[PDB]
Amino acid sequence: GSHMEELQNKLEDVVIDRNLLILGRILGEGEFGSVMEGNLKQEDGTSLKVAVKTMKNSSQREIEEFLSEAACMKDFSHPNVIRLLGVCIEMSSQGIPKPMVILPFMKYGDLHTYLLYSRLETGPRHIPLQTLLRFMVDIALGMEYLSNRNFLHRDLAARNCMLRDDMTVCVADFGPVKWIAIESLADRVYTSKSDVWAFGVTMWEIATRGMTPYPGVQNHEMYDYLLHGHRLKQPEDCLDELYEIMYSCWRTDPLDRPTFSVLRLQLERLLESLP
Ligand SMILES: Cc1cc(-c2c(C)nn(C)c2C)cnc1-c1nnc(N(C)Cc2ccc3ncc(-c4ccc(CN(C)C)cc4)n3c2)o1
Ligand SMILES: [Cl-]
Ligand SMILES: [Cl-]
Ligand SMILES: [Cl-]
């Protein structure tokens, strides 16, 4: 049918031949896998600098799920959503297949680190309120796009937002207890309104210039803390208007939280009103 037709079309475009790809040095590495710099030889002859993420259920079933999921993500097209360039599956000597995700290289890195570096002399300069709000608008735009097409991010945070060369923010690294909505801690349930909660936390990260959420509260304490109605406190010199917007993202009833489209309008309006 059309459902299967649309799936098979998407699966065609997603794979990249390993020979079109040169790996470079390791940028990050941990339990989940590794991120490396690389070069992707394109159809026009020239090479493109890329980031290559290698990821660790070793079975063929898991690989098929990965390729299908990758096909969907490859289909995203919005300037505030990271564009997946393709995937390569390299193989190991023990027979274990190793999936690799190819992404545009973002020399300015993730937004969280950038906010922290901005408080250091040698890093980027002090970030004014207008720019912080612009980061939030950009993220709201990307999430608005994603929720329109019923894609749940599942791990929205400043560390998973990337800065492009023009300082546009894009959402990335699609799925951290302190970013998880109260209902999702409770019932293991997750909607676009759970993403909205995470977005509020991300707004708070940006306005505090990279503070960890809920200082003095342990991860194991988080459910009971939220259960009694406590929320992230207003940062110092944060506009009450801006605080109201982030606060609305953590209303207890998920149906009372605004949509991303609503939040995005609110943020643009506030940004407009600044001198
Ligand atoms: C979009 C996406 C999808 C999937 C995925 C999943 C899950 N399932 N399936 C089926 C797929 C296809 C997995 N990951 C992503 C993803 N999106 N963004 C990222 N990355 C890795 C972040 C990123 C992106 C570009 C980029 N340029 C440079 C870096 C960089 C900068 C600094 C460092 C060093 N630090 C601080 C240690 C490291 C790297 N950099 C860092 O990954
Ligand atoms: Cl991109
Ligand atoms: Cl870029
Ligand atoms: Cl801090």
Ligand SMILES: [Cl-]
């Ligand atoms: Cl707090």
